[PDB]
Amino acid sequence: KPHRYRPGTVALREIRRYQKSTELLIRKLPFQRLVREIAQDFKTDLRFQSSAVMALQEASEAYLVALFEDTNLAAIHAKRVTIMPKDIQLARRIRGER
Amino acid sequence: KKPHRYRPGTVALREIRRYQKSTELLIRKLPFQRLVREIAQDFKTDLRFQSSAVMALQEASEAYLVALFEDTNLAAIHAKRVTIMPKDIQLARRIRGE
Amino acid sequence: KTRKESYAIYVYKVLKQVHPDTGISSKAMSIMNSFVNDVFERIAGEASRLAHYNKRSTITSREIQTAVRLLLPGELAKHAVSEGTKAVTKYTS
Amino acid sequence: TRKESYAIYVYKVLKQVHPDTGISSKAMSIMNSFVNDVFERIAGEASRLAHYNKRSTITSREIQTAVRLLLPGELAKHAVSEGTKAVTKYT
Amino acid sequence: LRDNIQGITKPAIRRLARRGGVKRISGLIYEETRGVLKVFLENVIRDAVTYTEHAKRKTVTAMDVVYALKRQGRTLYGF
Amino acid sequence: LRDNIQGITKPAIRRLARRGGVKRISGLIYEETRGVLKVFLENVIRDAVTYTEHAKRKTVTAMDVVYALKRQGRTLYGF
Amino acid sequence: RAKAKTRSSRAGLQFPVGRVHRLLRKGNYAERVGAGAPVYLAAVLEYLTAEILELAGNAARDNKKTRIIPRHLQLAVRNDEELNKLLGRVTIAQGGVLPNIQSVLLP
Amino acid sequence: RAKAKTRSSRAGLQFPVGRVHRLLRKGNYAERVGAGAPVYLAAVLEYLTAEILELAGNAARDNKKTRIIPRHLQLAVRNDEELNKLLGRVTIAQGGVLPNIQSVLLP
DNA sequence: CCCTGGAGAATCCCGGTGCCGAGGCCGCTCAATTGGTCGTAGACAGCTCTAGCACCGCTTAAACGCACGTACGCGC
């Protein structure tokens, strides 16, 4: 029989692992090409340095991690453990973003 | 004979409408002014405040608390509730960064 | 007495040029003066920062143009650029 | 060309408290960015403070006022005491 | 001056929540709101104290209150 | 360059929430997370575009992104 | 010398160009201030003032009022989504907030 | 021309007083800059640098590391309460967040 | 238990007072305006050379998808 970890045990293990390790969670090129297509709407002949994409990626993830922390706290506030899109919308509204 | 006996909530909604379109300062002047003096007396004694200085503090504190209450109220419907809680404020301040 | 710098009258001429039938109270006048003053430091502070980042000593028309693009968002900016551009061309001519 | 940085000065500060620990280049860049970012906040607040009272100069009191305005809690008082001790030793 | 934190009365906190569109207000909200207002006032007035002390003035003006609110991203128009 | 919003894959969004302490992730979270990431990127990169345009440069530097994030109160250390 | 025509009329503007230039010089921003910078600054401030006042006048006409009151200015700022994001961190005295009610809060 | 002794040594400091004074002059902050203003600024910067490095070294010792890495700096800033509020609006690269889990998320 | 008629009370439209803050006028004076004059930041032209852009092997950890069930969102 398989070990069959209960739902939450591996999720907690990823929580412990990623909160002490500073490896970059989103991949470089899939995030890099997203910058190019976003900046293409503003400038067609535009270039980005390797550190320029690097600076954008860590800032975006730390904003997303901080948003996920506020999204998670809203779930326990709403008697839940699963994050919801309406929890995200509440997080942006309280922070004044949207 | 029978009293009118308005149910809870309806007059509160009426008070919401009568005060959202209103302009006058909800907090009384002297109780807020006396609170300013005792707070300032812990930082510096023999300190005075101008009448417009207390007026400027009063509107800013009301608008900050009203905006906090809107985030407090919007968290209640997010938590499937209509009554705000002390923990609802604590979630709002944490998400706002306070 | 002492002349205190304010935009009390200049907001009034703007109001009549877009709405010649309404007035404005002094409390709303001070808010508009505060609004004009607060935006003034934000653009000038952004323009001062923009010149400092490029190691440039003067603030030109492009400095304000970049400052209002950074601060004013979206369609509100593009009219401000359009109104700003038409002001410089009229001033130079 | 020559690039202005705070790499060496932080290193001497590091050995003055823990001579047994080093620093990395990525940590140095964050430390250089931290000191630079705080520099503009205090100088910017001091520039605003001088502008408010029509003051054409920035003194030690200008920096002192920006410290208690920015740094919260006991951190400001320790920074004020450290600056006061440095001012007395300098003057 | 003591026990002035009760100057912000329960209907006053109730009226403030009515401006924010709050349906119902719990009994423990008023104590928490008073503490939040006390913390917020303890930051703005202290910042205004340093602004007033920097000007060699003994009375806090409304202009220093504006600067105290502006530096924390809560700028107030109309003074 | 099209359909690059899907480059932020589902495990990549999953790893972000695990760093944030999220235990359970809904299936509609990834689409919402992509939207708020697109909105956040459409502000910072556009701000860096104006910084790069004003600097008489055709390549966006990390230094321009530093001021772009700083002006929105999101200053980044380490560039 | 010649006639002392103002720079606001030369640029077709109402806001004072010279006042903006003087505050830019005395505000400790840069060593020098360009010629077109106060003209650009005056146009941006004038358009922002005109857009707010026009929306405030529309709000004043909504509640059949002739005189602009600070409630009208607050209503004008928050209703416009461009002004709302620009003045998101801005407190307006004697303005209140938007009179809206949540959908589930209605009777 | 007497002996050239730096103002940092006169004030018992390691941060450069003259460099701080120079950036204040060309930073377009004020028309004049006092003598004690760079002394006070460098002393505050020295104390903030020393306090952050002190907590970073303590965090490095907790992780059995004798070199300061950006994770240690992030842990040092967020653990200390006044540093957390001061740098609340500050993003730190290669630092992550604190390894904390909510009570109800525990098994 | 749900649909509909009548009446209690807070709110909305309207006539009269007036008053006190807002609109308009007079100086006039100090800050905006005119002309000249240089030090000098800045736009422009040529060199370059160091880093980004585009394509290629590859391999391998990262990612899409399907089967299953039990913690959990949601209805009452």
**Residues composing chain H:** 107
Torsion angles phi and psi, residue H68, rounded to 5: -80, 120
Flag whether residue E5 sits within 8 Å of chain D, measured between CB atoms. Answer: no
Residues 41-60 of chain G with CB under 8 A from chain C are 41-54, 56-57, 60
**Contacts D–F by Cβ distance under 8 A:** 15
Which residue, among H7, G104, F19, B7, has the nearest Cα to A58 in the 3D structure? F19
Q: Which chains touch A (3 or more CB pairs under 8 A)?
A: B, F, H
Cα(first)–Cα(last) distance of chain H, in Å?
74
- Lookup: tokens for H12: 């018992």
Q: Quick one: closest CA in B to A91, which residue?
A: B95
Domain residue ranges of chain C, discontinuous segments joined by +: 1-93
Which residue range is the domain that position A57 belongs to? 1-98
Q: Do E78 and C38 touch (CB under 8 A)?
A: no
Amino acid in the structure at residue C91: Y
Instruction: Give CATH for domain G1-107.
Output: 1.10.20.10
- Angle at which helices D25-52 and H70-79 pack, to 10 degrees? 40
Give the Cα separation of G62 and B21 in Å (integer). Answer: 13
Q: How far is C12 from chain E (nearest CA, A)?
A: 16
Q: What approach was used to elucidate this structure?
A: cryo-EM
Resolution of the coordinates in A?
Answer: 2.9
Q: Residue E28 maps to which CATH number?
A: 1.10.20.10
Strand I nucleotides within a 7 Å radius of protein CB atoms: 8-12, 21-23, 30-35, 41-43, 51-53, 62-64, 69-74
If DSSP codes are grouped into helix, strand and coil, which group holds residue D11?
A: helix
The distance between the two most distant Cα atoms of chain E, rounded to a whole number of Å, is 47
User: What residue has its CA nearest to the C1' of I40?
Assistant: C57
Tally of domains within chain A: 1
Give the Cα separation of D50 and B47 in Å (integer). Answer: 22
Q: Residue B69 maps to which CATH number?
A: 1.10.20.10
* Contact of H55 with D87, CB cutoff 8 Å: no
Taking contacts as CB-CB distances below 8 angstroms, the residues of chain G near B52 are none
Instruction: Give CATH for domain D1-91.
Output: 1.10.20.10
* Contact of D64 with D83, CB cutoff 8 Å: yes
Amino acid in the structure at residue H67: R
Tally of domains within chain F: 1
If DSSP codes are grouped into helix, strand and coil, which group holds residue F59?
A: strand
* HEC letters along chain B: CCCCCCCCCHHHHHHHHHHHCCCCCCCCHHHHHHHHHHHHHHHCCCCEECHHHHHHHHHHHHHHHHHHHHHHHHHHHHCCCCEECHHHHHHHHHHHCC
Question: Strand E75-77 to strand G90-92: parallel, antiparallel, or no bridges (unpaired)?
Answer: parallel
Beta-strand ranges (E) seen in G1-107 are 32-33, 67-68, 90-92
Which residue, among A85, B28, B25, B65, has the nearest Cα to E22 in the 3D structure? B65
Instruction: Identify the H or E element spanning F3.
Output: none
Give the Cα separation of D29 and C84 in Å (integer). Answer: 39
Q: Quick one: closest CA in D to F70, which residue?
A: D37
Q: How far is F52 from chain D (nearest CA, A)?
A: 21
Residue with tokens 């003194």: D59
Within 13 Å and on the Cβ side, how many CA atoms surround B73? 24
Q: Is the dihedral of CA C35, C40, C43, C48 positive or negative?
A: negative
Taking contacts as CB-CB distances below 8 angstroms, the residues of chain E near B39 are 38, 41-42, 45
Out of 1.10.3720.10, 1.10.20.10, 3.40.50.1370, 1.10.10.10, the CATH code matching C1-93 is: 1.10.20.10
